[PDB]
Amino acid sequence: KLLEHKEIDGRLKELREQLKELTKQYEKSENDLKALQSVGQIVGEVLKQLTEEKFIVKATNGPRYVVGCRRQLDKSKLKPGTRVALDMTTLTIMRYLPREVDPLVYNMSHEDPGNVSYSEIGGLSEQIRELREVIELPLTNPELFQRVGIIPPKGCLLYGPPGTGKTLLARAVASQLDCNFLKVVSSSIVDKYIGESARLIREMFNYARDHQPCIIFMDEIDAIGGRRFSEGTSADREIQRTLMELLNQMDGFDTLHRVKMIMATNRPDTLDPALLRPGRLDRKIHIDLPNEQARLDILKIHAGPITKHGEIDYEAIVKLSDGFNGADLRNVCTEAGMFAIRADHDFVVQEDFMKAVRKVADSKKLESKLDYKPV
Amino acid sequence: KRDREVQRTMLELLNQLDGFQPNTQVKVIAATNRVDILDPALLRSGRLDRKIEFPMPNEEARARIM
Amino acid sequence: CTKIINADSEDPKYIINVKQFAKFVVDLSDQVAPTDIEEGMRVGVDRN
Amino acid sequence: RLLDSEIKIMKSEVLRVTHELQAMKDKIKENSEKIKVNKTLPYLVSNVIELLDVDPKCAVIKTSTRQTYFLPVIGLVDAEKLKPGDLVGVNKDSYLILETLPTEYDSRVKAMEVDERPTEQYSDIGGLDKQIQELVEAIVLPMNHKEKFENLGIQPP
Numbered sequence: 001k002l003l004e005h006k007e008i009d010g011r012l013k014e015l016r017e018q019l020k021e022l023t024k025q026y027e028k029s030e031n032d033l034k035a036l037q038s039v040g041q042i043v044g045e046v047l048k049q050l051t052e053e054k055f056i057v058k059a060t061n062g063p064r065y066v067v068g069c070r071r072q073l074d075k076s077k078l079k080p081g082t083r084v085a086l087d088m089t090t091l092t093i094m095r096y097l098p099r100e101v102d103p104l105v106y107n108m109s110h111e112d113p114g115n116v117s118y119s120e121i122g123g124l125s126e127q128i129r130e131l132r133e134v135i136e137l138p139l140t141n142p143e144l145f146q147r148v149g150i151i152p153p154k155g156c157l158l159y160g161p162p163g164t165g166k167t168l169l170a171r172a173v174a175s176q177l178d179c180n181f182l183k184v185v186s187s188s189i190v191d192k193y194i195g196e197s198a199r200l201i202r203e204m205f206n207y208a209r210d211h212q213p214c215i216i217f218m219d220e221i222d223a224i225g226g227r228r229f230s231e232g233t234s235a236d237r238e239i240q241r242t243l244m245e246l247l248n249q250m251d252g253f254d255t256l257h258r259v260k261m262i263m264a265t266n267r268p269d270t271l272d273p274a275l276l277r278p279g280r281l282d283r284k285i286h287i288d289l290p291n292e293q294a295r296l297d298i299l300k301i302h303a304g305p306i307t308k309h310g311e312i313d314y315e316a317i318v319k320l321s322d323g324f325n326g327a328d329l330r331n332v333c334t335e336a337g338m339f340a341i342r343a344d345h346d347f348v349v350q351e352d353f354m355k356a357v358r359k360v361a362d363s364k365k366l367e368s369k370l371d372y373k374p375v
Numbered sequence: 376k377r378d379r380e381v382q383r384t385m386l387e388l389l390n391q392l393d394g395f396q397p398n399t400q401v402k403v404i405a406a407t408n409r410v411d412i413l414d415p416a417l418l419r420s421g422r423l424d425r426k427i428e429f430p431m432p433n434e435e436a437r438a439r440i441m
Numbered sequence: 442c443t444k445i446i447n448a449d450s451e452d453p454k455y456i457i458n459v460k461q462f463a464k465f466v467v468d469l470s471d472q473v474a475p476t477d478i479e480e481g482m483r484v485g486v487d488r489n
Numbered sequence: 490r491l492l493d494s495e496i497k498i499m500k501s502e503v504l505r506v507t508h509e510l511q512a513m514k515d516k517i518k519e520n521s522e523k524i525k526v527n528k529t530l531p532y533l534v535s536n537v538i539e540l541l542d543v544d545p546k547c548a549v550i551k552t553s554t555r556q557t558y559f560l561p562v563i564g565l566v567d568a569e570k571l572k573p574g575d576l577v578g579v580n581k582d583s584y585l586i587l588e589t590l591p592t593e594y595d596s597r598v599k600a601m602e603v604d605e606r607p608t609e610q611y612s613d614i615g616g617l618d619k620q621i622q623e624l625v626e627a628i629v630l631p632m633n634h635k636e637k638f639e640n641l642g643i644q645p646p
């Protein structure tokens with residue numbers, strides 16, 4: 001006699017499920033409707049304090065408004081320069097906020113470089129070891145240098161010809177280390193609005209200081225690091241302005257606490273001597289063309305995942321690979337795989353690599369490795 | 376080759392070409408008549424894997440052209 | 442004008458940029474057909 | 490005896506819960522209609538900034554009219570659907586967020602894309618079979634197959 005009992009019980013349970021779903025709809029509706037009647041609040045930065053009921057706020061890019069704290073805010077928290085929200089009606093402060101703004105810095109922090117172990121880089125053991133001495137040891141174990149006495153360097157620069165692994169090394173450092181990491185393209189930190197790039201540098205340094213320990217990586221620093229023109233357009237004016245802003249940020253009077261900084265450039269010569277001065281960039285790191293042994297190492301790294309067939313003579317490839325930058329050998333592996341694709345094969349043999357090396361050596365004649373200069 | 380405005384745009388171009396989490400699935404094709412002006416790092420093997428030379432048409436190639 | 446939404450295709454919604462002034466999400470007056478509007482299009486709008 | 494006594498309750502409960510569902514649905518309809526008529530359609534698009542944690546669902550907005558605003562509540566959009574630097578359409582007066590928007594990039598970039606799709610076949614190119622094959626296998630094969638490369642393991646050019 002289970003038919004009516006269990007069938008109608010299932011009907012009741014199904015109707016209860018539909019009721020809970022519909023009440024979820026209603027909860028969403030009433031909640032967002034209650035949120036609707038609210039209103040936004042203007043944002044601005046509290047300046048000097050007159051009395052315990054009178055304050056001064058510059059409403060961001062608006063004017064400066066004399067206003068008063070609402071009732072509950074701890075007056076101690078309303079420090080000169082802190083960020084607060086104001087009623088759009090009475091302008092009274094009703095909440096202090098986390099310090100500043102600029103999701104640009106948010107993007108430049110949450111940039112994902114991917115997992116790159118130091119082993120994934122080849123032939124740079126001295127430089128890799130060198131970088132960890134100025135980027136990792138001070139923030140991990142600051143107490144060590146107290147007994148050594150020597151204060152840690154804050155910034156150090158990577159310079160070398162294109163395709164030797166500078167950006168790769170930076171990616172590796174960002175991936176493995178457990179700290180706040182800022183990734184900079186020196187172009188995108190240069191905006192057209194008057195005096196906006198220097199402001200952006202200031203805010204990114206402030207973000208680093210608030211989120212200690214922090215690492216700042218500025219790739220292609222020569223974009224703004226160029227030598228200061230004596231005269232020029234608004235371009236020269238504001239670019240040198242941003243350069244001097246960054247300089248004041250890292251040079252001194254502020255003595256950056258845990259703001260260890262990294263930059264890379266293909267043209268260290270064009271950099272202003274103010275940057276290249278040792279106090280800012282103490283350990284200048286030259287990332288040379290890989291040696292024959294280093295070339296074999298990186299070749300082993302990038303040829304690894306390839307489904308090879310039979311023996312592989314990396315040594316002969318290294319022999320024909322004269323003067324190849326690191327990125328070239330990755331191109332060698334890619335071209336060998338492409339030759340295997342051409343043969344329709346599902347595997348790669350030594351002759352594929354040999355043809356690849358010849359092909360990229362022919363292309364090597366195009367990239368005129370000029371009379372290249374260091375810093 | 377490496378007025379700093381064009382230089383900065385070009386640098387943005389190479390950093391986009393290399394890219395953190397490189398290239399996702401975006402392939403790029405470039406055409407120039409004068410390689411000698413490109414030089415330092417745009418011709419890097421990473422950013423431009425394949426350099427394809429276009430020679431003056433061969434005699435049989437010219438016949439096919441016509 | 443910019444980037445017609447067209448999410449429901451009935452009132453497709455339009456994002457415009459009143460240059461020097463602001464940016465907005467707006468609709469059409471009933472007189473102008475959606476087929477009369479393309480992306481950008483330098484379109485003039487009412488004041489209210 | 491049995492199966493004949495419970496008949497009153499099992500159906501009366503269903504009908505009463507159905508009536509409750511009808512009334513609850515009516516309330517939802519009223520709320521939805523009021524919200525919809527509330528959704529005016531100027532929206533004053535604006536960029537999203539840090540979503541600060543609540544403390545006794547908070548967003549900071551930079552408006553297209555070059556003003557910054559703090560919202561005690563986001564509005565009619567879920568919090569995690571937002572990503573600082575994102576574009577949202579807000580109330581033109583109260584600045585509450587009621588939209589999620591495509592980013593948009595630039596007029597130049599929209600003009601940059603190809604919609605005409607020209608129609609030159611590889612046959613019209615003559616004498617370049619080496620070069621045409623080179624470019625095709627360099628570009629189109631990752632577009633179409635993507636399995637040859639992963640089978641070999643190489644990163645495609």
Ligand SMILES: Nc1ncnc2c1ncn2[C@@H]1O[C@H](COP(=O)(O)OP(=O)(O)OP(=O)(O)O)[C@@H](O)[C@H]1O
Nearest residue numbers: 120121122162163164165166167168298326327393
């Ligand atoms: N030592 C190395 N070990 C492994 N891979 C390397 C090495 N050197 C270069 N590569 C390869 O070449 C590329 C490294 O170039 P990367 O993008 O890091 O910048 P770069 O050529 O040093 O300069 P920039 O990005 O500043 O122009 C990567 O694709 C990486 O796989």
Ligand SMILES: [Mg+2]
Nearest residue numbers: 167219220264
């Ligand atoms: Mg780089």
